[PDB]
Structure formats: C-alpha cells, structure tokens
Amino acid sequence: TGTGLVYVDAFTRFHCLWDASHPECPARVSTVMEMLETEGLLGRCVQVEARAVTEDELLLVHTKEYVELMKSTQNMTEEELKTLAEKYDSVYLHPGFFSSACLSVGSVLQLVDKVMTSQLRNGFSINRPPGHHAQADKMNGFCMFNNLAIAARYAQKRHRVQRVLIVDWDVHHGQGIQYIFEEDPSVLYFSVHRYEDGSFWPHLKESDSSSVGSGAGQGYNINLPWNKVGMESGDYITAFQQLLLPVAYEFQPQLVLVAAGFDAVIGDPLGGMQVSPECFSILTHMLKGVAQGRLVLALEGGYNLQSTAEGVCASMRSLLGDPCPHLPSSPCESALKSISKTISDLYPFWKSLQT
Numbered sequence: 390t391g392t393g394l395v396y397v398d399a400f401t402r403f404h405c406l407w408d409a410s411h412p413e414c415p416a417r418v419s420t421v422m423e424m425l426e427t428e429g430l431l432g433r434c435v436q437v438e439a440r441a442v443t444e445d446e447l448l449l450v451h452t453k454e455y456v457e458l459m460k461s462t463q464n465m466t467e468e469e470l471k472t473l474a475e476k477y478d479s480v481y482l483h484p485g486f487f488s489s490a491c492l493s494v495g496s497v498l499q500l501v502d503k504v505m506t507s508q509l510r511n512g513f514s515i516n517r518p519p520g521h522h523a524q525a526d527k528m529n530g531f532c533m534f535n536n537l538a539i540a541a542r543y544a545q546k547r548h549r550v551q552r553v554l555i556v557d558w559d560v561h562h563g564q565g566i567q568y569i570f571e572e573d574p575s576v577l578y579f580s581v582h583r584y585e586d587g588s589f590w591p592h593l594k595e596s597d598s599s600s601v602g603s604g605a606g607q608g609y610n611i612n613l614p615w616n617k618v619g620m621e622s623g624d625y626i627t628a629f630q631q632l633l634l635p636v637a638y639e640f641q642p643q644l645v646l647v648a649a650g651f652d653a654v655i656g657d658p659l660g661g662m663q664v665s666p667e668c669f670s671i672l673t674h675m676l677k678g679v680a681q682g683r684l685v686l687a688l689e690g691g692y693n694l695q696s697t698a699e700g701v702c703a704s705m706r707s708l709l710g711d712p713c714p715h716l717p718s719s720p721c722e723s724a725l726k727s728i729s730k731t732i733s734d735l736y737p738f739w740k741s742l743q744t
C-alpha cells in the first residue's frame with residue numbers, strides 16, 4: 390500500500406541531565422518531523438501507532454538480568470542513574486529513558502508488522518534512543534536496547550521470516566548488532582563506518598573487515614571501514630553497487646532493516662564525512678530491489694539537526710516512490726582501498742563477489 394511513519398512525543402521525553410549540549414538530544418527527532426512536514430512528506434505517509442516492547446520481545450536479544458536492571462531505571466534517583474551510567478561507555482541516563490527506549494523498539498516492531506503482512510510497502514521510524522550499539526547485557530554509545538536486533542529476531546519468530554538483512558549506514562560501527570548475530574547465518578549484518586585503524590569510536594579491531602563472523606556465521610558479517618575522513622556520495626554508491634547489493638541479491642533476504650543514521654552527512658559535527666543528504670535517496674532506492682522491497686528504516690545517529698532532517702527526507706522520498714535525484718557529486722583512493730579489502734575478506738563466501 391503506502392509508506393509507514395512512526396513518531397511519538399515520548400521520543401522527546403529524555404535528555405542528558407548533566408550536559409545541556411549533549412548531541413543526543415530531543416531536538417533531533419522534532420527537527421526531522423518539522424522538515425518532513427514542511428516538505429509535504431509527512432502527510433503522504435501512513436501514520437502508524439507506536440507501542441511498548443514486551444519483555445519477551447526484549448528477551449529475544451537481552452538478558453533477563455539486564456532488562457530488570459533497565460526497568461529499575463524509572464525509579465532511581467539522579468545519583469543512582471548517574472552512577473549506573475558511568476559503568477558504561479558513552480551513555481547517559483534519565484528517569485524517562487527506559488520508557489522512551491521501549492517505545493523506540495516497539496516503533497520498529499510495529500513497522501515490521503505492517504510491512505511483513507503487506508499492509509504497507511515500507512516504513513520509517515523517527516525514533517530515539519538509538520540502538521545499534523546496545524548489547525545483550527550492556528548499554529553503549531547512547532543506546533539502551535538494540536532496536537533492530539530485536540526487530541530482526543521478532544520478524545523471525547512472529548512472521549516466520551528465515552533471512553533478515555541489516556544495513557547499517559550510520560557513520561559508527563554497530564558492534565552491538567555484530568556481536569548479537571556474530572554466529573548467526575540467518576541475519577546478515579552489513580556496516581559501513583568510519584574506523585581509521587581504530588582511532589575512531591568505538592575503537593574496536595572487531596570493526597575491521599577481517600571480522601566476517603564466526604562458526605556458522607562466517608561470511609554473514611560484512612564491515613566496510615573508512616580510514617580517511619571526508620568520504621562522499623560516490624564512495625557510498627560504489628560500496629553499494631559492487632559489495633552490498635551483489636551480496637544482498639545472493640542472500641535473498643525476506644526483510645531489510647536499515648540502521649538509518651545520518652552522521653555521515655556533510656555538516657555532522659561527529660562523523661567527519663561529506664556525504665550529501667540526497668545520496669541516501671539513491672542508497673534507499675537500491676535496497677527497494679531486494680526482499681520485495683520489504684524495507685524498514687530506523688533512526689540511529691545523526692547530530693546536525695538540519696543535515697539529519699535532510700537525510701531522512703531524501704530517504705523518505707525514495708520510500709514514497711519519488712524519482713531519484715540528480716547528485717551534484719561524482720570514489721577516492723582510500724575508499725576504493727577499503728572496498729577491495731572487504732571484498733577480499735568476503736570473496737570466499739559470495740559468488741557475486743568473485744571476479
């Protein structure tokens with residue numbers, strides 16, 4: 390039918406209590422919604438209710454120990470929240486975090502429901518907190534629960550999906566998603582990210598392309614690390630055309646989930662990349678060719694309010710069926726070196742890569 394959109398004001402109901410300038414702030418999602426409206430895109434979407442994730446849903450990924458400690462966050466004093474946050478890497482807490490995080494997960498599951506039952510063609514959750522760093526028993530990197538990792542397993546259980554592709558074009562490596570599915574050949578994880586031999590957060594050798602998955606998961610984890618700043622649309626277009634999409638068509642997923650971060654867009658104060666927002670119209674378009682176009686995007690990172698709004702808008706135009714834009718740009722030496730090396734590491738597992 391149409392394109393679903395989930396957003397709730399509860400997504401604005403948590404923020405960093407000890408820094409008023411923390412980049413992961415409520416104005417991220419309200420600026421996206423403002424631009425979607427002024428551009429006429431919001432009204433062309435099917436509005437979809439959010440819902441709170443269930444514990445059984447959360448237990449698809451997270452431990453009962455971690456869920457309960459999380460649920461306890463809504464009744465801790467500030468000091469007890471600040472003290473638990475410091476036990477994690479790059480994470481703040483707030484009395485409303487757990488509630489908004491449950492709705493952040495559920496927003497994705499609502500879209501998976503409507504897309505998997507052909508009620509909608511695709512959808513986009515304008516959610517925070519983000520998720521792709523959250524791990525089975527740990528907060529990490531502004532994330533409490535791993536939205537897409539839960540959605541992937543949820544789709545497999547509730548909708549009898551065999552194979553899920555997760556595409557993570559946020560500028561950071563989604564190491565949480567990697568770890569959850571590291572041994573799992575039914576969930577193919579692809580991440581393109583700033584890396585710089587480990588100097589860029591999260592500073593993990595596991596973010597390099599030599600991490601291809603383990604055991605039965607070998608070949609089903611694909612990292613494309615950038616080792617020079619300033620990458621552009623041509624770097625991402627090349628990556629998608631000759632690496633991800635060949636592997637995707639060969640994998641034949643039944644659902645595609647996008648960790649839709651926009652911190653690689655030019656102007657982001659964190660990602661140090663130069664991607665134009667319209668590039669994501671082209672990347673989104675390519676993904677619509679797989680899995681009968683059953684495609685759900687969920688907001689991850691992106692910290693320039695205007696650049697992230699424009700990146701969401703370009704993605705949305707493609708979800709809605711608008712013509713592909715003209716791009717004023719046209720890969721660098723560092724980017725091609727990265728793509729060759731990732732292809733080399735994944736060569737033995739994918740015929741579509743073999744030339």
Ligand SMILES: O=C(CCCCCCC(=O)Nc1ccc(I)cc1)NO
Binds near residue numbers: 650659
């Ligand atoms: O986008 C993301 C999550 C990004 C996590 C990055 C952690 C390091 C960092 O930049 N921390 C920071 C702390 C305070 C201020 I003020 C500005 C920045 N995942 O995709």
Ligand SMILES: [K+]
Binds near residue numbers: 582
């Ligand atoms: K990524």
Ligand SMILES: [K+]
Binds near residue numbers: 572574576602606610
């Ligand atoms: K995997």
Ligand SMILES: [Zn+2]
Binds near residue numbers: 560561652691
């Ligand atoms: Zn990010």
